Design a protein around this nucleic acid. Structure first.
Ligand SMILES: Nc1ncnc2c1ncn2[C@@H]1O[C@H](COP(=O)(O)OP(=O)(O)OP(=O)(O)O)[C@@H](O)[C@H]1O
Ligand SMILES: Nc1ncnc2c1ncn2[C@@H]1O[C@H](COP(=O)(O)OP(=O)(O)OP(=O)(O)O)[C@@H](O)[C@H]1O
Ligand SMILES: Nc1ncnc2c1ncn2[C@@H]1O[C@H](COP(=O)(O)OP(=O)(O)OP(=O)(O)O)[C@@H](O)[C@H]1O
Ligand SMILES: Nc1ncnc2c1ncn2[C@@H]1O[C@H](COP(=O)(O)OP(=O)(O)OP(=O)(O)O)[C@@H](O)[C@H]1O
Ligand SMILES: Nc1ncnc2c1ncn2[C@@H]1O[C@H](COP(=O)(O)OP(=O)(O)OP(=O)(O)O)[C@@H](O)[C@H]1O
Lengths: 362, 362, 362, 362, 362
DNA sequence: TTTTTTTT
């Protein structure tokens, strides 16, 4: 009798497992009997307890195999291959619906009976976020449509403002919402070539806190970032396929994703200024600070950074009509759940608290 | 029974597939029964639904194999081999004749019954491009000849002028038409060797927005691009075969392809100026912007960036006899279909709208 | 008859052997009869004498294999895979609990009947460490809580004071207790990239001797480190993931670990001062100096460096309920053993000796 | 019939051979008739003539093998694994006995009847070394003990004196005795970090001819050695582990070995002076110079630089109990040989001769 | 039947082929019928005609093997292993013996029945060489002996003399006789250091003309040479091992090989002067150059810098006893030939023609 | 082994 490589590939597929070592370690856990498996019985990880009993017999035979790493290598390549197929064949809209399905699936667990997310704490986060900029939910919707359309040379948004104005905070949540990567371009030009490699097949990117020069007039430290970006002008325009590489990999050629740039108030060359479709100014506000001091469970649990928070904001504010047709059904059920939990006065009480700079809860 | 490596190889030829992961991913989809395959029934992409039913039998047994990446590698090698044989033995006119047939096949689908595109929106785009320069269709025909003849040291066209003059736009559609690559040479020299490795067996190349020096007087940020290019005179001249890199691969020796350079107008040292047979100077023209602004679907469907649009322009403007003889049969049908669909009065009406800067339609 | 790869993997798991050559060498030693084995009889190394009798039969066949290094590689992969699974799934409390179990095992040997270590000398160490700072045991307990909760911004501690004031001693003991790595950020700004690479998957980090500037007024050597630090606030605040690089490896994205900063008396920018929950002032007290002169076995055996010494300090001082609930049983057993061998008056006599600056033992 | 890989592995172990080509070459020699073998009959090389008979049958069958390098590679791995195990498990005192046994084996050859060397010429070297410092043999014994104990802080010895005063000579001999490496820290502070990587797993290090500053007033060339060194106190004290680089390869952590520092009479900061256990300083002496000038076979045979000479000196002067138990039997036999070979009056003549600065032999 | 790998390995040993491709090519030539092999019949190349008939049948089967390069790789390892063995066991005297034995083999066929050269051309070579300075045969024999012993400090000779004074010409020829390299030191300190690893395993080394600092006091253009050498002391003296490095590579330890310095007439500090056994001085010479101008077959066939010309010069001047004791037979055999083919009068006529500066032949 | 890193 022999290992079924097919069953391992199925496990890799259904867990979306990218890493060969993680896959290996996970699969080997199944060799003990599920019947007593404490990880199953304590329901500790779904990517274990859902699968252990199914995969058990093949795991025992796999445990004896002499090829174990080769089998995992084949499985992981299949997961990688499916991503590459999807990168070419899906519409950008349909990609976003898949991503939303996955966040909505994680939310199903978080706010379940199992798991521990207090939906009231998370809704308090939405209140604080909705304060950070005027018409916040409209701003998020405009960004999402811009990311779907990916209109050439209208692909990038610039966040400006003083330090501690929440710009990277807001960038973090958007990145989780869409999926994508942060990049640091203040590097030297040689390392920069490998830095850009991580963009491959990603949907969205964020350039974190690029440095200009001469901002030492406001005591901004100087650095290369702005000048490096103005060399990469082509990559922002997104009109033509560009060549990207990773350590020991031959290049791949694709259109470089859309995204966000964040900075303090250095001056921007006109060449680069013309690449941004929109700029947003962030400013420090005392009531947010005073509220947040009295509300630190927000930060302790990282609610304010997380794409889950933005998704809850959208579900609150936007019509069902604005979602794609497949997910509209789940959207209606979540809208139903939220309204049952929170009346508007309860939500307004929160927003009123934040504006008053008391702790969000009274 | 056992996997036919032959049938896998045949599919790779049919699809003209280079990436082993893209090949692997798509071939695996055929493992499920085509009898109900939703991708077939929704007729989503032809590279699937044409082939699924034929390959299903072999795709099933492939899904069980332990060699999968090895089989895909050999198939990918066969596709790459075909490209290298063609690269040596065909006339440049034959290569382009084959290239046109591929685009025309895509146009059969785009305006077919599946008909996802609208021929009117696409023809509106043609009017917009022909308005971009004097005698546009003549300039296109000149460029094709120059690339086909490939006269040594008379091989390169320089596009120049300010931001948003459109030079990238025009370059993009040409690159699609002829099937080249873009390259970025503003990086430092020690990275550059592997970048140029991309140009192996390519028909055409474009170097994008190569940064110069001294134009800082006009606030053009300085860079290395011009210095890098002037180190590479030989590659422009195409006078003698030169060596090209790939990671983990030994050098390939061949003549470096012809093509196009874009700049916002830094100064060009005369060693480098001597190597351009022609230069075209682009100008911002506000009424185009106003037309675009009221014609959003052009950019959103990326119409004006497509060689498909340029092919439609040539079919509208040029004599049948000017095309390579084998295609002329297809040209006649496309000319007929165009005349059937568009009255010249409609095309005149459109071009008037473009000139007026109203939205193209009325 | 065949080799059992399973038994090798089991030995590698049990020994947690990370290195293929270390694994290979030790396994081959078992091929001689354990019944006569000199290393067994001298009870020299636990990873041998516990295991020789069990694996002897398989080691005899392993000695004839032609595959030997291939067997070992698969085994080492299994141990590495287990670490990555743990890294992604354990709670930080679980991690720390495991680490303590390791130290408790090493203590059972050191103070075992075979053990070389005189528990009295190690208690003298704890008396000296407890004199280093007021409320020393409470201070340690606070630090551990802070590491396990890993609350954003509330993450970093500052050790400050003159040369030869013990800060590196305490840092090393804490780093041993928790596991982690030292980092040097006085480097020029480019090399920092690979330097930060070592933090990958670590529980804890320490920044040595960050050199300020302008402390040359106080004859302090000036250097870059302080400026390098405030340029990394996103790493310290731990609120958002960062990208980390190792030589020859693709980046991984994670929350940067919590840690400790150590310095002599440079001035600190207020922006940087805000990052730290606690600053601890170390000052030289020459009665400790005169004590070490007359208690040198502390230094010679490195007792005052050891996490083992801090663990004994916790066991002696803290209530049982404070320990991770599972291992509380082992803690009680160690408390009982300590109570048996050291009456409070014995320990307090030692502490009084240290206070007098005289030799600890009398 | 089959090659025994086991017999090759034995030969590699018995010869301590760890270059795959060196092993491969020598094993192939055994294919020819042992009975006839000229090398055996010349008794020329022990690693041959001790072995050729034993291995002859297996070497013949190995000569037909289609697989030869794989066998040698596995054998080499066995020898490297043995070193790896030993490096982590042995006591420092056992390492020294191992190192001593090796030298004693080579002396059995050199002064055996087959040996080319003259024990009287080597004994002349011992006398010249003994005159280089008062109580030379006690100095050497103290130094060795210090390295074996490796007591923290009490780890480093300083050699001072004019050029051509022998400090390099003695350091080289000690380093040949114990094993270790030299280092140069006159470098700038960037290159330094790769330079220290040399020390990994070494038993000793030596710092060669560090340059101070302002020694130019004594014509001593200035340099950064001392300033670099005074910043490394944590490496010297040996009280905690440190991180060590290598080019390309990844970082490593260990205690920095004990060692020796050598210089001309620059000043030293008191901060650095406190690092040293023992300042030894060298005068040039004319009679040593004149004696060398009349006994140049010493230099020509490189006797006075050799660790063999130091071992001979220890045997001549030290009590047997000062040697570790295992070697004491060989020590007794060598003492007895030496007593038989030199009556004390011979040695007294040699010493008194050197005191007259005439050539050692008369 | 099947390929004998053994026969291939014998041929590689007998022909001392280092290169896998060269081996493969030549062995394939044997596949055609030896019984009428036209290359054999033309007696073109001993490496073929001496072996074809013997290897014929095996070469036929070799041509049908599917595995050919694998056979050749193992055979090439056998030859490289033989070098690695000898490189670590022979005396320098034996090494030179082999080196001469090789050149005498070349000499045997060079003027064999193929008549492929005329000795008189080389006698004119020898004649011109002996004119270069006094007693040139003795200078060779002495320098040769000097390098064979490699006695410490007594290791370096200095070649003074202007541009185009022949010092380079001489050393290049003498390196053919011995084997070794030339090196440069007129270097910035990085490059100075990274040259040094080239010396690894060199039997002998040379310095290319050292452009000593401030030679422009003599109008000699200069760089770092002098003080670099004066500070690189011990490398000259060869007293103790030194560790040597080249770019990216690791260091390795040996005694630094002996050698010679070429210099134009720069300044020397007596410190650096003291490092040398001999000063020699050079010039272009006017009869000699007018002879070269008239004797150009010497330069055309490279005779005047062949080591073969030095070998012949020794065989002419030096008695048989001065040569390696087994090789002395061949010395007699070649003395016979030259003493037969040339009277001393024809040698005197040639030498007299050099003395007149007239074309050596008359 | 190349590559990446070292080297620059
Ligand atoms: N608009 C704001 N007004 C006041 N406090 C703010 C504001 N935004 C953020 N904060 C506080 O400042 C902290 C840092 O926020 P954040 O990191 O997003 O700032 P940033 O200016 O965007 O930073 P950086 O430029 O370094 O990425 C937050 O955790 C919160 O405590
Ligand atoms: N001639 C033009 N007049 C007005 N608008 C133009 C013109 N050409 C292009 N545009 C607008 O400018 C946008 C960018 O065009 P494009 O990138 O081709 O210009 P470019 O001159 O090559 O710029 P750059 O050098 O900055 O990349 C187009 O998408 C279109 O909206
Ligand atoms: N409080 C103290 N009073 C006096 N001596 C002390 C005190 N603490 C430490 N020592 C002495 O200082 C020596 C060095 O300690 P340690 O390495 O921790 O100092 P440090 O100030 O943290 O040094 P560095 O900043 O150089 O790493 C100890 O071995 C001990 O001899
Ligand atoms: N005590 C001495 N008196 C006189 N000459 C000496 C003495 N010791 C060594 N020599 C001579 O000095 C030569 C060099 O010795 P060595 O390299 O050990 O000296 P050093 O003091 O370490 O020199 P440097 O500082 O130049 O490296 C020896 O080979 C010997 O010829
Ligand atoms: N004594 C000589 N008589 C005639 N020609 C000579 C003599 N010396 C050198 N030349 C000519 O000059 C050429 C260059 O010689 P070589 O390079 O050996 O000289 P060099 O002194 O080392 O030169 P440089 O110092 O300029 O590098 C010789 O090959 C020869 O053609």
């Amino acid at each position: 009798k022999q290992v079924s490589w097919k069953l391992v590939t199925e496990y890799a597929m259904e867990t979306k497992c990218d890493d060969v070592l993680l896959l290996l370690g996970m699969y080997l856990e199944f060799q003990y009997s599920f019947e007593m498996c404490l990880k199953c019985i304590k329901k500790e990880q779904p990517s274990h307890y859902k699968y252990h009993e199914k995969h058990y017999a093949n795991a025992a035979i796999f445990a004896d195999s002499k090829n174990q790493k080769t089998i995992c290598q084949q499985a992981v390549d299949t997961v990688l291959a499916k991503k590459r197929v999807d990168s070419l064949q899906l519409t950008r809209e349909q990609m976003l619906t898949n991503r939303f399905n996955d966040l909505l699936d994680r939310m199903d667990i978080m706010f379940g009976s199992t798991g521990s997310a207090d939906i009231e704490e998370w809704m308090a986060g939405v209140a604080w976020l909705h304060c950070l900029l005027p018409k916040m939910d409209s701003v998020v919707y405009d960004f999402l449509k811009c990311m779907v359309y990916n209109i050439p040379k209208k692909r990038y948004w610039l966040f400006k403002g003083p330090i501690d104005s929440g710009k990277t905070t807001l960038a973090a949540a958007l990145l989780e919402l869409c999926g994508g990567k942060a990049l640091n371009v203040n590097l030297p030009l040689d390392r920069l070539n490998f830095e850009l490699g991580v963009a491959i097949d990603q949907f969205l990117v964020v350039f974190e806190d690029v440095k200009g020069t001469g901002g030492e007039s406001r005591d901004l430290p100087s650095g290369q970032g702005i000048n490096n970006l103005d060399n990469l002008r082509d990559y922002l325009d997104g009109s033509v396929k560009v060549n990207l590489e990773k350590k020991h990999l031959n290049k791949r050629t694709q259109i470089f994703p859309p995204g966000i740039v964040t900075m303090n108030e250095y001056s921007v060359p006109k060449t680069l200024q013309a690449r941004f479709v929109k700029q947003i100014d962030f400013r420090p506000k005392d009531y947010l600070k005073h509220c947040l001091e009295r509300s630190e469970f927000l930060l302790e649990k990282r609610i304010i950074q997380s794409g889950i928070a933005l998704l809850l904001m959208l579900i609150w504010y936007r019509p069902v009509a604005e979602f794609a047709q497949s997910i509209q059904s789940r959207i209606v059920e979540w809208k139903e759940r939220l309204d049952k939990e929170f009346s508007l006065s309860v939500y307004q009480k929160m927003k009123f608290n934040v504006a008053m700079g008391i702790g969000v809860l009274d």
